[PDB]
Structure 1
Amino acid sequence: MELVEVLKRGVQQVTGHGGLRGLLRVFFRANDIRIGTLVGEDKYGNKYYEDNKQFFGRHRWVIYTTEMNGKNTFWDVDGSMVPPEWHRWLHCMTDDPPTTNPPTARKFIWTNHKFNVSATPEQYVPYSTTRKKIHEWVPPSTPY
């Protein structure tokens, strides 16, 4: 019957992430087991799996890293860590990943992405980009 086949599919889900270590590393960390096809690995650790038999919010997904820029994201994960080459494919602006239709190379584009910095150091602080407009008079350093 079909109950046995779904049990087989669940067995494959349980047994397609390495072992118990690799299974718990995904289950305690993403609360899902669904196996898909590895589209490509990023230059930080992200994995970017795919399974088009699901519906149009789950046909694509990510499994993040455990260290991006010395931050230990094994538990503290955030969506700011998807770089722009994969942001476009993950939010479904394309059917064309960067492993096949990559982007243009430019000298000024950042090589290493940066996640959101809001409370850390190396965050952003605003300031006047302009200069002194009304200059003062510096008096002389002699009397009379």
Structure 2
Amino acid sequence: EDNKQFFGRHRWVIYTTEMNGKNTFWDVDGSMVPPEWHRWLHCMTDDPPTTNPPTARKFIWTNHKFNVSATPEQYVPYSTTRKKIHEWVPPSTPYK
């Protein structure tokens, strides 16, 4: 931070050069910012997560993930419901 800069330039992040096994020396993007810092960096609050940490919940991701589009980790949609109609299964044994 530098609060002498005008609003918009008064906060910034220097991204890591490696995240989740990806080389980010040149390939950085906004999705690398984890949720606790995303709130501070977008000025949704004045309080950084160092002095104002978020609530701890057991189900919250411990490892942030950036945008994984067009990688083997990309999301692929699918129907989450099970089969509705059930076919009759013909007998295995013959009939004469």
- Structure number with the higher helix fraction is 1
For residues 55-114 of structure 1, the C-alpha deviation after alignment (integer angstroms, 9 at most, x for no partner) is: 000000000011001110000000000000000000001110001111000000000000
Q: CA deviation at 1:122?
A: 1.1
Q: Give ranges in structure 2 of 5+ residues lacking alignment.
A: none
What is the TM-score of this pair, normalised by structure 2? Answer: 0.97
Q: CA deviation at 1:143?
A: 1.2
Aligned residue in 2 for 1:103: 54
Distance 1:103 1:143 in 2: 67
Q: Which of the residues 70, 74, 87 maps onto 1:136? A: 87
Q: Give ranges in structure 1 of 5+ residues lacking alignment.
A: 1-49
Once the two structures are aligned, what percentage of the paired residues are identical? 100
Superposition CA RMSD, Å: 0.5
Q: CA deviation at 1:121?
A: 0.4
User: Alignment partner of 1:61: what SS?
Assistant: coil
Distance 2:54 2:9 in 1: 24
Q: Which structure 1 residue ranges, 4+ long, deviate > 2 Å from structure 2?
A: none
What is the TM-score of this pair, normalised by structure 1? Answer: 0.65
